[model samples]
Target chain A: VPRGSHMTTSERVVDLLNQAALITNDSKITVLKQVQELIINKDPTLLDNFLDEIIAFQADKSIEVRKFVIGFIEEACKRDIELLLKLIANLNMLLRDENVNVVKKAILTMTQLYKVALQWMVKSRVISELQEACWDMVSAMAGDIILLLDSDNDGIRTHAIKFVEGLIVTLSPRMADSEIPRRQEHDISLDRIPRDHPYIQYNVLWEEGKAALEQLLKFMVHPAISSINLTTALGSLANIARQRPMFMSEVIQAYETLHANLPPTLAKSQVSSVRKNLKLHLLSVLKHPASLEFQAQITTLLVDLGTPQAEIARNMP
Target chain B: LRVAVVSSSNQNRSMEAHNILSKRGFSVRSFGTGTHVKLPGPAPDKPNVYDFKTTYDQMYNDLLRKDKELYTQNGILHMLDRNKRIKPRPERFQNCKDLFDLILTCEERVYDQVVEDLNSREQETCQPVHVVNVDIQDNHEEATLGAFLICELCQCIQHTEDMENEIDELLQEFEEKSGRTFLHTVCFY
Candidate 1:
């Protein structure tokens, strides 16, 4: 029978989701495309009524449907932040997703959500409360992202690095001239911001975030990893260090630990070359102005390593 | 040949060399050996100290407001005015990555520091960086004199053919003629 205009939009949305479950993959995708259009421009009641049914398609056997679900939920989150809980709930299930592409898309979605939330909190001047509500989920998601760094698939590992790098860029202060300038319409000068303002506390939150991420960085330079992996990992680490000098101590520590425990047997292999690249990248961070506390240890480490750059580090106050 | 000038503070001596070297059309960079840039001030206790974030222009305007009388009396403002014209911020030696044919130092300590850093690298990682330490006093007069000497030496190092093979002999001759001490040399494999 021909569908009647008498059917409410909510009923139609529900009917499409129900129809999606029984159909072939291509048919389900076609149904989803219509459902996405409704969710994007249709009434809130339609989404509120069927949010769960829509989320369940995350496990759809078709890769296309699963990816579509991520984009759908991401769009929903942007349209209405009230869907945050629903987004996180669905994301928890999809994070361990078997498909690498699905996982990468999930990572990208989470990073986008995370950035939007941070900007919102900063603008609202309600960081402590927002952080209380947000940190646990975000940090847990970060740990999940870190786990993907060890994935057997190269694309997954590379995108995972990109995800973390995006998070770091969002967290770092946007004050430096070299950095991308903050939007002029919403610009806030660092000097004028009150000490108690949450803008200042962004660093503290990032420090906590780093705790979850540090081990993953260490995993990158591990002796067993291939030069190709090491090159990618160290390159990413160098970029992070350049942007966030606060991570310098952690970087130096990773270099020292890797240098000290290097087994004699692998000296014949390309491990030494990887270590050299790692040292060169790490030394660039050491060159930045940081706390004097690490001075003695870094100098000793550099001297032991025997690079020309280390000579400068050795004499620095 | 590419060259980098190093000093305990990138404020005075290195910037002087940087300006002189750059003017002579040599591709050169200057870097600080210290943890932060420390400049001479009117008062003994309160030297004009800065970091990467505190630029020369910022410091110049700030000090002018804090103690205009002493700054103007002691010519500290003049020094800062000159500094702002040279370069915006100091670069740390550790931050430099480009391979330089020669690295010239203004003091023996800087020479030792540069050599020690180069020596610490893995053998394969070390490039053929010829380090020369020309002992110049840390004040303005000596730095001006040293800039002239450095430019002269840089020209000699770049122009002469087969100079790479005869660095030690060239260093000996330059030292004898210029009455300057050439501290040490290291050839990276």
Candidate 2:
């Protein structure tokens, strides 16, 4: 018999689950698909009661159903930030799923939700309430996300880098102009006095930036990191070095080591692209007075790598 | 109440509370009682030190002149960018003219310095003030959480008859409930 449409959402979900248990694999998928569609489009009501049941099915024997569960949760949270908090624990649990795709998808979904929460925190006129609710939600999941930077899987590690980048730039007024364009409207004029510049603000990015520096250093050498991921990693490292000039020497050393260790059999064009990107970021760090003290050492390193002294000198004061 | 939040460099913690409380509609000021505003330099031992007399814009412009790309790419330019907006300039608690009803110090050492400074001023002018030491960690998130706690305490004081006694009770209750020993208070009324 077709389930009556007038039933309460929860009652309808329960009826589906009961029928799901009595069915074959194909029938189970059909029942799960119904729930997925209901959650995505039809039912806008609270699914807190069904959260565990939905999560438990993530381990369903069929890969198709498991993937659907992940997609369903991701779509559900995209519709409501409040639902992300309600299901964050379940989402974190899926990070340990036996399937690699399931784990990566979970992390990526959580990252998407974190971005939404952050945007709401920034753009909403009522920030005090949002901060109290969403900051803790996002930060609680951040530690788990950081753990993935060391994962042996390239896909997971790449998404983790994206996660950290989003976390840092989301709230960092320091990186505001580059990341959040709306903020540029208030950018101070070049000749403004000390008291008049408009970007003074505080956010949780500084703490995450400190944590990212350590993680990016480790990920730089991960065997699974792809060429594209390496570029992203290098950019993030330079971003940190620019902010925390105290670590300039470390950044310089990492760059030199990465340059030296470039696989000899790789294409010359690939090597050339890396060298250019490396110098671009390194020059940013080398320009700092703190880093400038290492000018002689870095210049020697850059010259050995075939970068011109004039190029390095152009970046200097 | 007139409040002042003091820390070593006045860069992070105190600035956090200064910003938070000001937004919450409190009359507030912030200070770094240090001799110089010390910032992390290229090396650990060799910090980039700036005097309070030099405006943040001056330091920022000086760094930009040396390396604008690095200055902008990293957060130093942004740090100075925020510092300049904290006030006309960072102020020293030791030299401030206005007396504050409440002073919240972010560290134990700062609490002691503020107390000693007040004592010296007490001898010269015979004024009384209330100073409370609330130890806030030097990280962005912790400073933020600390600011929230301080803001709550400020709200409680607004409702109470006895200000210092209320802050003391509330701090005790907060520590008990949060299960964290991050806040400490030593007050002289």
Candidate 3:
């Protein structure tokens, strides 16, 4: 007899929900497909409610499920921004989640929503709401994501890093164009200027930017991603430095100890297309007759990084 | 928002003309196209947008390649149209055919918009924009804005005459005024 015939309609759905939660990865995929088919055919009223519950339960615990949820939500929200915002209101409650996977998925969902809603946002003149949401979501994730940096738990850290990456991409423009004053615009010539001038010194934004970098670096430290993405991260840091030199200096100071232990190869990794990225910075620094300390540090670092270290290269095989 | 615009037509060796002015600086903030817009915070460990050179290059190449893929071989005209955005001289400015004057007005409008927007929101000082137009003299008119920072606008036509040196000279002038050290990569149609 069919499983539905064995119990009440609601009871049968509940049983499938429990079973779905326990299903292993390979079989869970099959189950999910079957459930989709069932939804298509059956005129089940509580089906949406059940799927939502199961998704919450499953995604709450499983990284695999969270990944799928990100993709699922992206597809659903692409055509429907209003529904996306509604779903995100409830999803905001999950932003406070402690589970790394849950937070990662939430951030991913927010990232996609931000992208799709941008058009509507422009049309509706709700750039303010979108901007505020960006800060709220990114700020909320900052601490948790930062904790994942250089973590021993590679999978968890990787998931967190992916969130950080998405957050970085999604919120950058918003922050860059934020309604706050900027360091670049601060009038150094004006002594009477208040320290808190909105356009004079952007302390708040600097903090947010720092949070994003700290998380990115943590992920970059992982052996798998560190090599492929080091240049990217480093380049990102360089840009921050360029935008707000004071903040950049602060970051360099904070990371000094880590820099000391950093692999030379990682520091020296270069891509041809990416050459221009660092060229100005390198040139700007190198063009100056190397102050003794700068010259010494750069020379020692380059010598060590001239070619890929045998140890890291060996790990590839 | 301090921008350094460079245009190839004005090649005079004067400090006054060196500062090419335009809407780019305002556009940078207005459009959120900062070089390192999405970089990290307090102890940011990653490179900002500016440092993603490789990514930018790849993006540039991919865009060019995909664009080519969509069009026919030597479809230079299409490339120019797709990659460039240039507003022609408005009717009011028709009598002012001077490229220099047109550039100045366009840049002023751009700067004004930036100031108005930033000030209205009580944001910080807006950067001055820089506009640089390069005439490659390849008989191909082109304009390209690469990630916002590197923008080039040019007008060239095959006049069955050797005007290469004159255009190249113009490019040199623009480069010098803009304080840009090199011009290795340019968008040529």
Candidate 4:
């Protein structure tokens, strides 16, 4: 039997989800395709049956299923926020299930809903509820990062780091000029991690947001390091500084000290890229421009880059 | 030819003005206090100095409070285990208000140092460009306590620095972050 006609009703829903992932970026077809898929699966009787069975299974004590549901809802919401929010409103009413997985999924779904609620921020009342939910979601994830980073499994470790990075990107706001404040004050320090720490030590080098940028920079100028790590470290450092510049002043002097030591050879070869990225990094860090350290660091990086036409390519695009 | 100063305001006019002044043999300066204006200086041959002052009310508090809301929103719904979510909070969220206050102080100090560097420059080759400051104080209640800090620092930096090219880079940086434009408190002397 052909796939479109022969599959069981539930099986069709499963297939649609599988197809959803592959077609997500299809500009011309994603929305139309999603609506068609949902419509085909929506007979009143069959739809009710699936919803009831799924709701019953929502109580199952399984992390795998819970994660699947989260993926399902996330994909669904991308198509229709109104329906997603309604689903979540219904979901919020059922908290008595003993499954931690269900609870986590529910919280995650709420987080997504909060993100999609950006339009509500302009209104007074809607913003309040959205704001509350947003904080609660962050509160929930803070703990998850610890355990996921600590998981003995490697898949979880990689996924967890990506999650942390995504959260950092979403949270950091732009300030004045070229300064981004740090997202997490203590998360990214090489010398500071305990061996038992959940996240890989190398990944931690990417954290501490803006604070570690100076350190990454010093590594860049040092002859002992290679360019791959130099760029990656700089990439990560730029991310941190872009996210958080509150820690900038303490680190600016450190960057200066490193800049002063730049071997003439490396400076001649790599400083241009470094300077441009650093300027962007600086702009990002100051998203809020509230930190003196952030301002100083940006000032210092720009000053050191100098006015040579050679340095033009280094500023933000 | 050079970024003589970058305003903190993210304004195009000031940036354009900066390029204009720098290319025409005038020194450029940036301001972060949030207020802006234009003013003449001692001479064209001397370096320019711009001063930007804060104009908004409860500026830091308003901004930080919004962030506080954001922090809490992200914290609560975060999809992680309890241990992970809770561990980084006291420092990240709990102390953020205090941390930002410290950041503001440090920023003010950097501004002061920049101003001082300008003043120490030899007048012979330096162009004296001045960026005026303004505050539309409503209800007779000044914008806020620290609104004047950026302007004060601007005055100070103009009085003390050596006005080296390095100093110009630093000043340009200041212009970039102080507010949104050149006329509002950013100056070139």
Candidate 5:
């Protein structure tokens, strides 16, 4: 039977998902690719009452399909934030996924959605009950994900480290030259965002998120951790400090102690590569305007790292 | 360059080199190759002994109690005093995992032990190290000259662009200049 143009777009999307759900995983992915084209160009009403059909794919037994829907919600929610409310329950379920890929992807989706919600919350003058509920759940899920630094999976740990970086970026103020520069076009940071905004709780969010960075610094110098863990840690901490002077103080402290007190179990090559990244990123933060106060300390530390006097002179404040 | 100074029990020769190296602003650590640390006792065939974990001060106090005048005249008191200032206690070379570019051994026996222990372990890093032996006797006068010679040797290798490539020539010239022979060999960790 030929496809009928007489079918409504809502009915078209629902039935496409219905069949995509019944088939193999790859077909469903192609179906999502097709469905995105069908309704994305049209009005939001095209899928207004039809979200349940799309959200139902979260349960597809195929890992591919499961992974696809997690990503699908990431874009879907950004297009219409009400989809965020529809997706949180399932996001938690996928966060518990056994497959490392699926779980890592799920955690990464939270980074995107958390920022999406932050922007939505910051721009609005009035907040709704659903918005309040959604923010609360995200806040809870974020705390759970932050604890995954202890996860046995290296991929999961690294992904969560990146998640904390995102949290710091979105939770920080929008001040330039002294704070993290917003990377994404839609990224939002609180700039003295109202204290009594009910759900935003800018101060509390900033404290928790900033403290997560400090936790990462602790891991950077931990003895029991592996080289990969240390590398991921210093890499993330250095970049975070490069953006804001608030983190610059602690980052330089870790850098100073780490030069003399590194893990004894690491390989020569492993430690070498780590120091290479350290020198590269530390040099960058020295150029950052935020680290102005720590220039003398940084200059001496850079000397310990084997950077030539000429290069330190170039980066010095 | 990072250097590790090794001697029989880390009581005299290694500590002398460690003291000189520390004062010269070099990154250096001292260790003993023997199973336990030994210090001169009241008489021959009976040396005061302590485990590597025992502090230099503990050995000094024990020897002081055994016979302060005897150990003091022998200069074990002064050597122990110098060792305490340089480091807290003797460290075992086998217990240390720090990869050094140079390992300076005070005697051929310690050199042999360092080579044996290094070979017994798994080569995790496969990094190159030069293990060189200096024939310093267990006498105070000999140790002082040995430490001065080791300091010059450290400065030479630290300044060399590529020690592995030019080590033969450098050691030949050093041997000629010092009127001494070096039993130097390479090993990887």
Candidate 6:
């Protein structure tokens, strides 16, 4: 950068592209944005690096720069699936990327790509199992989804928690079936496709999703979690229970464990909000008609959390 | 739907209706058409009386002291306990200034009494409310049944995109299913 001050303006941009591939924080995203403009627009003023120069950004030196590329792959792949295979080919690399920030970004965007990529594969009329190959790669590496909770990085775990919620939605019944789910009028879930629909073998995602739910429920009561992480995880777990209600008991049991021995690390200010989320969503699930059988236990847990009987009746009614 | 469940007394009929609708996420209030809030006393001919503004808690505590077992055995204590939590006190139908899409009374007399008040209140917004009389026998189990029926009607009325177009058929359909005659009139505010 010091030597660049003496370099002429004409000599700078191509090297700016090269330098952008090297390091970034703010100017880094700016340079990459300009570079993407050329490729996406098929700019005729370009040189030949096979758009491979942009693809090569996966190995960028800075975390800021590397994560910037991680997001770029999502947007770029979404814009045109032409690069989906190429862009997605390295997604798991980013998922297991060295930096936690890059790995979490891959996770946040990767779940979204599940729908698009699955659709793209089905449109291409690929074989059933291979249609979801990318997701299979993701699911095969599902341990990281669970392992993410062990991080002291609260934001990373917070975002990782949503992966399960998205998985449930994507793999659960997208629409109501003959069985008639409790509250899915125009609601999104895997039910959008009939069960065992071949095009959306998102059953793979849902399979790991079950495993994710198990670990996620366990993570909520872990002693090492700070209140912020625990609160976000509680809301995340509550969301799945509200949607499916099948896991309401599991979520409530975790709440009971935490209430019994809340983390001492919780800042006094943070602890109240955690307890608020715990019992608020516990009652919320009871409102779901499918949760009727679970209501007795749900009510029992609400009472144990010190929720008043009068208050509980009002909420359920 | 913005609705009012009007009864002769807001004691059991209107109040239970209020609680069910309120909890179901509706804009509903219960008010009495009769001049005084009344409840049964020790004998058939005797009745305890309260002014409209009297809090249910005030009535509740007083009755508990008079003969704890007598009121408790009669279910008055439980009713008052619930009423106080639903709201501080009973409200008078005549004093209600708010507008609603529907007004349901538990009996024809309460329905008839309500129309006179609605007729006299000067028409302002020109909004029309369907005041339907759902004949509920004035008893404990009947009131609970009446409250449930009132909620179903309110829910149906709300589901319609335009209540004005739907009110006629809705009542007839409700009339058929409930196996009870409906006495209804349109009131304007």
* TM-score of every prediction relative to native: 0.43, 0.40, 0.32, 0.28, 0.58, 0.48
Per-residue lDDT over A1-317 for candidate 5, one digit per residue giving the tens place of the 0 to 100 score: 25656877777777777777677647778887667666655546665566676667777777777888787777678688877777888888899987776787788788778877877776678888987888789888988888988876655666777777667766766556654333453456656568788667778877886777777776666676555456556656665675555667888888888877878875544465456556766786787787878888877778888999998878765
Candidate 1 lDDT, A85-165, residue by residue in tens: 547767767777887657767887775676655454455545555454665575578768877777766446555666665
| Candidate 4 structure quality by residue, lDDT tens digits, A1-317 | 27567656556655554554345343413433443445333542343333433333333344444444454455555454434434454455332234443443444454344344332222223334545564344344443443444443322332233334334433334334433234233222233334444322324333533322333344455564322223334334444444444434544554565556644443222443344344434444444344444554555566656634344333334
Residue B163 miss distance in model 1 (angstroms): 54
Q: What is the interface RMSD of each candidate, in Å?
A: 17.6, 27.5, 16.8, 22.2, 18.0, 25.1
lDDT of 5 at B125: 28
Model 4 residue runs over 4 Å out of place are A1-70, A77-138, A150-162, A165-237, A243-309, A312-317, B1-189
- Candidate that would win on DockQ: 3
Writing each residue's lDDT as its tens digit, candidate 2 over A179-230 gives 2224233432111112222221232344565566667777787654454356
Standalone chain B TM-score for every prediction? 0.86, 0.83, 0.21, 0.21, 0.95, 0.95
Quantify all predictions' global Cα lDDT against the true fold. Answer: 0.65, 0.64, 0.37, 0.36, 0.75, 0.69
Instruction: Tell me, per candidate, how large a share of the native contacts it keeps.
Output: 0.00, 0.00, 0.03, 0.00, 0.00, 0.00
> Model 1 reaches what TM-score against the true structure?
0.43
lDDT of model 4, residue A122 = 21
Candidate 6 per-residue C-alpha lDDT over A151-209 given as tens digits, one digit per residue, 9 for 90 to 100: 65654665566665556555554322122324334333554444555555656656755
Q: In CAPRI terms, where does candidate 3 land?
A: incorrect
Best by TM-score: 5
lDDT of 4: 0.36
Candidate 5 has a TM-score of 0.58
Candidate 6 DockQ, CA atoms? 0.01
- TM-score ranking of the models: 5, 6, 1, 2, 3, 4
- Model 5 chain A: worst 10 consecutive residues (lDDT sum): A178-187
User: lDDT of model 2 at residue A58?
Assistant: 71
Q: Chain A vs. true chain A, TM-score per candidate?
A: 0.62, 0.57, 0.42, 0.37, 0.88, 0.70
Q: Where does the lowest 10-residue lDDT sum fall in candidate 2 chain B?
A: B119-128
